[model samples]
Target: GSSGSSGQESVEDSLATVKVVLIPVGQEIVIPFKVDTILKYLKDHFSHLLGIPHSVLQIRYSGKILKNNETLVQHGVKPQEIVQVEIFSTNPDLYPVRRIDGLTDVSQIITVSGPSSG
Candidate 1:
């Protein structure tokens, strides 16, 4: 498909949105995360809750289980919990699923200032 020249779309023009969320769990520490439901939906073609990053690691959230396959709703997401959820537009649902590699390298810059900001 390469009638290639300076007039070309190098697979970046038809891209989808990447959603990342920063949420408050409770009186505890605020958590920042990225959801992979869309990734699973496209790559695996299955509706599944993607794993939580480093959930199985040593330091769990309030003794919570940190694993790669854990969901937000399952990890004791109580009331008043502010979870930032993103639904990417360039997700597998839009373009050619077989062609797109998708965005795995997500970047986040979260500044949690808590309830008290002076």
Candidate 2:
């Protein structure tokens, strides 16, 4: 008696959501980033929303920096894994200006502007 069921893997496992935590902003959100999805694509997608260029963005997870050509699975990333988003700009001084010391919550916004002319 032959059965129709092959008893193989399903498509659900192939698809997964990765949790990416944005630094400075401290926004945590789950993204439907398939294991096969390229890291460059992820960076570009987020860059558009963050209003930052993709080249300046770096995606990190578990102490390993992700590469553009590498796939999620290739990096040994699983579902709901935390990914830290960091901005890598040419000027190191920019971070010191943007980073606030007293605020524990990274999401807190701190604006520093020059004196307005009345």
Candidate 3:
């Protein structure tokens, strides 16, 4: 009889949870991701937590940069192994801005007024 047992077994066998660390800042985070998790996905996920854009992140394992298309399993990333996260500012225009601060790159302050009923 044809069954999905084989497919299920493969999925269970390949499933993994890895521990990766972000470098430079030295923020260690344990991530529970699939062994087949792509490099770009990992980078983008942490980019949000780090308050940085995805393009600014550079994910690496060992001494080499991890390519976007590559997976953790391919790089031999074990459940307790670590990976590096580097910030390589791809876009320079992404400057940090304060919510209440009146400082703007172009204008000093732009007043925002609520709707008025005449």
Best by TM-score: 2
Better of 2 and 3 by lDDT: 2
lDDT by residue for model 3 (42-105), tens: 5665556456666565665567777878887787766544344443434435723112122232
* lDDT (10s digit) by residue, model 2, range 58-110: 76666767788978778676754444444343333442113223324323346
Better of 1 and 3 by TM-score: 3
lDDT of 1 by residue, 50-96 (tens): 22221111113443434435544455453333443322212323321
Clash count (model 1, backbone only): 10
Please count the clashing residue pairs in each candidate, in the order shown.
10, 0, 0
Q: Which stretches of candidate 3 lie over 4 Å from their true place?
A: 1-12, 77-118
Candidates sorted on lDDT, descending: 2, 3, 1
Query: Which predicted model would earn the best lDDT?
Result: 2
lDDT at residue 76 of model 2 (Cα atoms): 71
Residue 52 of model 3, lDDT score: 66
Give per-model TM-scores: 0.21, 0.56, 0.50
Error of 3 at 25 (Å): 2.1
In candidate 3, clashing pairs total 0
